[PDB]
A paper describes a structure:
However, a construct encoding for the catalytic domain (AAD) of Pf-WRS (228–632) crystallized in the presence of L-tryptophan (L-Trp). These crystals diffracted to 2.6 Å resolution and belong to space group P21 with two dimers of Pf-WRS AAD in the asymmetric unit (solvent content of ∼56%). Structure of Pf-WRS AAD (monomer) consists of 6 β strands and 19 α helices and each monomer harbors the N-terminal aminoacylation domain (residues 228–496) and an anticodon-binding domain (residues 497–629). Well defined electron density was observed for the bound L-Trp in the active site of all four chains. We could only observe clear electron density for the bound L-Trp but not for ATP although crystals were grown in the presence of both. In Pf-WRS AAD crystal structure residues 482–512 include the ATP-binding motif KMSST which is completely disordered. However, the KMSST loop in Pf-WRS has a fifteen residues insertion immediately following this key motif. A potassium ion (K+ ion) was observed at the dimer interface and the coordination distances between this ion, protein atoms and water molecules are in ranges of 2.8–3.6 Å. Residues from both monomers contribute to the ligation of the bound K+ ion, which to our knowledge has not been reported for any WRS crystal structure so far. Sequence identity between parasite and human enzyme counterparts is ∼55% and the overall fold of Pf-WRS is hence very similar to Hs-WRS.
Numbering used by the authors:
A (entry chain C): 245 to 486, 513 to 537, 551 to 631
B (entry chain A): 245 to 489, 513 to 629
Write the structure that this text describes.
Amino acid sequence: INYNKLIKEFGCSKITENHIKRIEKLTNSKAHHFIRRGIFFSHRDLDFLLNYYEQHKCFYIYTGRGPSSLSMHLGHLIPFYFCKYLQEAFNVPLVIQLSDDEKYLFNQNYSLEYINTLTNENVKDIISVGLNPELTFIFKNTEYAGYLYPTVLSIHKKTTLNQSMNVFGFNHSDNIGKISYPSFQIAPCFSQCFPNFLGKNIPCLVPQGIDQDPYFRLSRDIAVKMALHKPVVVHSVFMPGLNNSVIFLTDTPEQIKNKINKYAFSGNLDKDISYQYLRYLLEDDNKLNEIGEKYKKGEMLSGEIKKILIDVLTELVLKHQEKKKSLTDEEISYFFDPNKPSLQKFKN
Amino acid sequence: INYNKLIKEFGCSKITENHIKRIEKLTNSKAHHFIRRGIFFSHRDLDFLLNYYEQHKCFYIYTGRGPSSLSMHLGHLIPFYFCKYLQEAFNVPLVIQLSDDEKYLFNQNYSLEYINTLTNENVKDIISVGLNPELTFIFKNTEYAGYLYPTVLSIHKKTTLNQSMNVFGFNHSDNIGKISYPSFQIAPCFSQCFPNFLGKNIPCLVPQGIDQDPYFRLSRDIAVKMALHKPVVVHSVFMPGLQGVNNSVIFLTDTPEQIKNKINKYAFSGGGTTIQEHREKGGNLDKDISYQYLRYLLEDDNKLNEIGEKYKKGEMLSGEIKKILIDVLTELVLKHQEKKKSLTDEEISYFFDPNKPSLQKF
Ligand SMILES: N[C@@H](Cc1c[nH]c2ccccc12)C(=O)O
Ligand SMILES: N[C@@H](Cc1c[nH]c2ccccc12)C(=O)O
Ligand SMILES: [K+]
């Protein structure tokens, strides 16, 4: 996949060192390694957002999760780790949508109950990332649709069937729920969908996988029509693989060791899957650079990098499972309260 | 239109004398004149509904209004007079949807605010019909969508885009909100949409204009897929506007004067012809718009029969019938206006409360 080609093809902008310097200046801390290492690499209107934060110290983050399975892996958790950082760095509210409606509509043999099981577990996996419970609002569409609906209607009216089908690749055999859904994913980009804790027309930062862009490329056109702020968009590169070409957060140190040893492509910094995974997982640059140099020059063996990765991954997965098991129902239910005076309520 | 052709074409059935006698038996009161005179004439699954009421003494009514205008007229209020009757006769909950979302999505230049301004007035017109507040729940889709959504999702998933477009005549230029909407009108046909006061899979009676049938022809095929009851449906004929089958209709904002004008200058006369020719010809009830309206407004079958007989035989003048209509209309409209003016904000708010103990029957 040619990312630089995609940026210019769909009208995005590369994240620059200036963006980073301004982020560190405004947050009074070091930028996350996702930004420094170009994992989150492209954006729309980030400059506007940074200036708006500088001038008003106010905005909110919005991301989502589609509960189509019980088994999440690290790639799914990448944007949530990132939202955790943004949440703490700027001290702003985070909003997380669970498109249980989408997964119900797109999966023919799935019922709402099943989707809800998947949803609850995915929610616990997401919370287990380390999100600030005070600065977080999670919602299921099946429950928050009433708060989303007037905004959805405006988006509905400004989206022709032609546009929905062209943008999302729908055909005439798809159910009208699939056609109507994208407005519900677009809606939370507008702060009127959260009257309990947010003011009107507050800029929205949307961290997302690249594959989610069609939703928010459309949201920016409709935002102009609705006379509201265009969603500030931030994209991530797809996490590379190498049928269990992934690391599940239910996996054991044993299975992680086996998968890494037997399947992780080795390589060359750019073809070694393990060094990339370390690019994701290692916060300190010195380490990453040392391992990178030793490996590129030949001093370090493959099985070494494999070992260090297995260690890091093992600690991560174990801590995550611990946090997961630690979760009480009240702790989870707290995340669904929009009435927290707490952070949530200060952004007006 | 040929209604008997429609009945066969779309798989409905005429309401019979057996149905009327049975309704009178179960309600212990005379059947409403809308039924006796074939104004509400066609149905689906009325026998099942009457059996169910005989067995459990309960069901619920569902009808709706699209707030597309500030000025409602008689034809608009026809099914609401009919719902007031059913509500009182059977002693059952009445559910009323205001599809402000529909009218927002179908009218390019209407804001949600303007629409809301419309439905707030439409609601007062609807209530002023004489609905029982204790047995009535009114809701705006813009406010109740959260209660509708899980059911709408199931209906969505069971409707292909092709089917939606073919049933409702949509094209690829229509917004996706218009394609989405029908599931929201279909949703209240299922009691799970009213958890606060309704029980499990309760049979739903939907009185409607004949042009709403595609919604509920679709609701019945979808119920089968959701394993829920098919909506018991009851249709009314179109109320013939003035000037053949402002100002071919009479508004409930009109003054007695305006009604006088409208009738005397625009009511099709049927009998008419030459000043004397009518004395022996004489008067044709089927074409006389006045007698047709009196069919809607006169409860007493005997007055209607007398006026009609005299006007058909020729003794009655077009102007006389005209005048009878002026006074009936005037009384009705004035009464409606007084009732509408008397409405307090709290009385109105009481209609929107889903937690009324009077509604709470499981
Ligand atoms: N539909 C997305 C989940 C999602 C919903 N809202 C979002 C907003 C931003 C990013 C992702 C989302 C998926 O299945 O992957
Ligand atoms: N769509 C109808 C109003 C309506 C909504 N729900 C209904 C249920 C039954 C009959 C009519 C309705 C109209 O504009 O005329
Ligand atoms: K189902």
